[PDB]
Amino acid sequence: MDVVSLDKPFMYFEEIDNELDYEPESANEVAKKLPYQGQLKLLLGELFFLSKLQRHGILDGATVVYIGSAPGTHIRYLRDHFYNLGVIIKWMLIDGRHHDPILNGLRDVTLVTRFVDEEYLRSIKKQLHPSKIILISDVASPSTADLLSNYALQNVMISILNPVASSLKWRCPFPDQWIKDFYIPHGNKMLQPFAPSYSAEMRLLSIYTGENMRLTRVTKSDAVNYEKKMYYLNKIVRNKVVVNFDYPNQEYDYFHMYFMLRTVYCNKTFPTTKAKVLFLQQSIFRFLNIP
Amino acid sequence: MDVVSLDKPFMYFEEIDNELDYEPESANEVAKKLPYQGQLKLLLGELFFLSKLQRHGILDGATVVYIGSAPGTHIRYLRDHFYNLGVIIKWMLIDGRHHDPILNGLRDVTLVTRFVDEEYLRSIKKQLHPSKIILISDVASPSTADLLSNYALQNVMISILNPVASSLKWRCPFPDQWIKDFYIPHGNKMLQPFAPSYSAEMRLLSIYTGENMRLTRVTKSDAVNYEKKMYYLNKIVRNKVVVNFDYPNQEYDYFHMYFMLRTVYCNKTFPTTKAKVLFLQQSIFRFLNIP
Ligand SMILES: C[S@@+](CC[C@H](N)C(=O)[O-])C[C@H]1O[C@@H](n2cnc3c(N)ncnc32)[C@H](O)[C@@H]1O
Ligand SMILES: C[S@@+](CC[C@H](N)C(=O)[O-])C[C@H]1O[C@@H](n2cnc3c(N)ncnc32)[C@H](O)[C@@H]1O
Incomplete structure (x- = not known):
């Protein structure tokens, strides 16, 4: 077995302190x-993100x-969670594809069937x-062309x-397929537990203050760094069993998930952080039909 | 006469502490x-800008x-100034129109006849x-459409x-002709002495550090503010004769020009800041054929 003792997991890309030569055979x-690992991946990151905004009083x-957002099955859980906590939020889910019917019939959630473009964005802004x-x-x-187009749409x-x-x-294009x-x-x-085994995707979390918009340049050398750091995290780190982790599941991904879930607010009061997380995790897996 | 005593002139837009309802009849x-007031306007701002970079050791x-850059008559003076000071700079002047022949025959200056576009920019970057x-x-x-296109090219x-x-x-579009x-x-x-009487144009001076690129949003309310602050500066301020200004010319624009020129480096040593500025101003006007 691949045992190890860790204090905390890597939460952000910037914390990864090692690298490995990417081996294309990993693909x-x-x-x-x-099952439904992708909905789980998305639910954890969005709960983490949204719970943070709640702390700053901006939710x-x-x-x-x-x-x-489509199918967006996991979004129903997110909506329920904040709704049950008493937070007032209006959800607007826009995708050209269709959403999970469990999202229908809620006055607080609007489902839109439209692939957005710059013009459409201006329209809904108004x-x-x-x-x-x-x-x-x-x-x-x-x-790489597809990615740049998506990223260009995101900045828009x-x-x-x-x-x-x-x-x-956010997934940096491969250096060997650099375009510009x-x-x-x-x-x-933000790093994502339960991301595909060798995924180099993360989630870019920003809070805007004033009229300012700060951007950062990404070059091919940056791309090599992303590739090596993420390959080291996927190949080595995520394959560890954290034995000093007091939890029914000691796989690194569950250890990483614990640190995200411990930041989530619940109505129910728990004697220990461990009780709250086990509860939230149970709740999340039951909702998604994950054993 | 419209007399007044001032400590210093307004150097930046942010310093303008008053506003006036814009009167369209000012146009x-x-x-x-x-004569050649536009070349003068450009020479002063670029000397001010470049002299600053020299201070920071980045020139x-x-x-x-x-x-x-075309015709670019005033650029010859700029080139001569830094060249005579011993600063090593390569000039690349790009415009679809033709440059003043006084710019020919200098190994340190390359004249290019091309209207640039995104593709061309990538080419010269390489x-x-x-x-x-x-x-x-x-x-x-x-x-406003033209302006937005120019500004979009500048960010590119x-x-x-x-x-x-x-x-x-940088000139903010008129609020009444807002597009987006x-x-x-x-x-x-940076504010510009010798700009047209009612011009709302200024010069945006930026120094880049790291891979970061910080932008700022401009809205119609911002546009109303620009219009009123600049109209107040043009109508009221620039029409003043600063009597406590010990200089052969007390018009506000000369007072404003003095503060820009006092930051310029010369080989010749002067007993007073006043001697250096009178000298630089004499030199600049003689070069441009301004009495
Ligand atoms: C990875 S799937 C999203 C999964 C979703 N976030 C979830 O919770 O199930 C990517 C989606 O982006 C959508 N998409 C692609 N381009 C789009 C656009 N311009 N406007 C809206 N949605 C678009 C696709 O139709 C697809 O449903
Ligand atoms: C106000 S004039 C410039 C005066 C010049 N700075 C001077 O020192 O004399 C604006 C200029 O921008 C040029 N211009 C317009 N679009 C351009 C582009 N895409 N590439 C290069 N120059 C362009 C025009 O040809 C014109 O010469």
């Missing part, structure tokens, strides 16, 4: 070990515009006015919508 | 009172890429590599060229 390795009264917007983007079409979402905070999908340098919004690069 | 008022060894770039942009085609210059510093042309909000690079909004 043919099992990518997922859980209540906001309209959450989620683009690239519509939403003057509500505070929190943007979540999970749009996917990829090639922020400039037009002018959100108070955002969560964007580009800018992405400045923000924390 | 038919005499815009310029000096020597750089390549100055000036887009929208060319210039690995020289440090200082960008100066004076491109003009305006309508920065993202592709990735300069260490930049000077960009846009972002401009963050930087000091």
Whole structure:
């Protein structure tokens, strides 16, 4: 067995303190070990993100515009959670594809069937006015050309919508398929437990203050660094069993999930952080039909 | 006479502490009172800008890429000044129109006849590599649509060229002809003596550190503010004779010019700041054929 003792897991990309030469043969390795693993991956990051905004008092009264939301099965759990806590939020789910019917019949959630473009964004901005917007983007079409197009659309979402905070999908293109340098919004690069086995995707979390918009340049050398750091995390780190982790599941991903869930608010009071997390995790897995 | 005593002039937009309702009839008022006033306006701001970079030690060894440089008569003076001081700079002057022949025959200055576009920018970036770039942009085609296009090209210059510093042309569109909000690079909004009588144009001065690119949003309310502050400066302030200004010319514009010129370096040593400025001003006017 691959045992180890750790204090805390890597929460952000910036914390990864080691690298490994990427081995392309990793691509043919099992990518997922859980049913609905993708909905789980998304639920944990968005709960982590949204719970943070709650702490800063910027969630209540906001309209959450989620683009690239279909099917969005996991979003029902998110909506229920904050709704049951007494937080007032209006959800606007926009995708060209159709959403899970469990999302129907809620006065607080609007499902829209439209692939957004710059023009459409301006239209709903006029519509939403003057509500505070929190943007979540999970749009996917990829090639380097595809990625750059998605990232270009994401920067457009922020400039037009002018959100108070955002969560964007972020995977650096492969250095060997570099096309050109580009800018992405400045923000924390949140790591994702339960991401595919060798995925280099993370979630860019930003909170906007004033009229300012700070971007950061990404070059090929940056791309080599992403590739090596993420390959080290996937190949070595995520394969560890954290034995000093007092929890029914000691796999690194559960250890990493624990640190995200411990930041979540519940109505029920728990004697220990361990009780709250086991409870939230049980609740999340039951909702998603994960044994 | 319209007399007054002032400590210092307004150097940046942010210093303007008053406003006036813009009177559209101002547009038919005499815009310029000096021959070659536009070359003078440009020379003072670029000398001010470049002399600052010299102070920060970021001028020597750089390549100055000036887009929208034709005819560029005043640029010969700029080139001579730093050249005579011993600073090593390569000038690259790009415009679809033709430059003043006084710029020919200098090994340190390259004249290019091309209207730049995004593709061309990438091409000269590859060319210039690995020289440090200082960008100066004076491109003009305006309508609000025209302005937005120019500003969009200017942001493209920065993202592709990735300069260490930049000077960009900046005039906020009229609120009554608003089309849509846009972002401009963050930087000091340098005011310009000898600008047309009622011009609301300034020069955006930025110094870049790291891979970061900070932008700022401009809305219609911002546009109303620009219009009123600049109209107050043009109508009231620039029409003053600063009597406590010990100088052969007490017009506000000369008082404002003095503060820019006092920051310029000369080989010749002067007993007083007044002697240096009178000398530089004499030199500048003689070069431009201004009495
Ligand atoms: C990875 S899937 C999203 C999964 C979703 N976030 C979830 O919770 O199930 C990416 C999605 O982005 C959507 N998409 C692609 N381009 C889009 C656009 N311009 N507007 C809206 N959605 C788009 C696709 O239709 C697809 O449903
Ligand atoms: C106000 S004039 C510039 C004056 C110049 N800075 C001087 O020192 O004399 C604006 C100029 O921008 C140029 N211009 C317009 N679009 C351009 C582009 N895409 N590439 C280069 N120059 C362009 C025009 O040809 C014109 O010469």
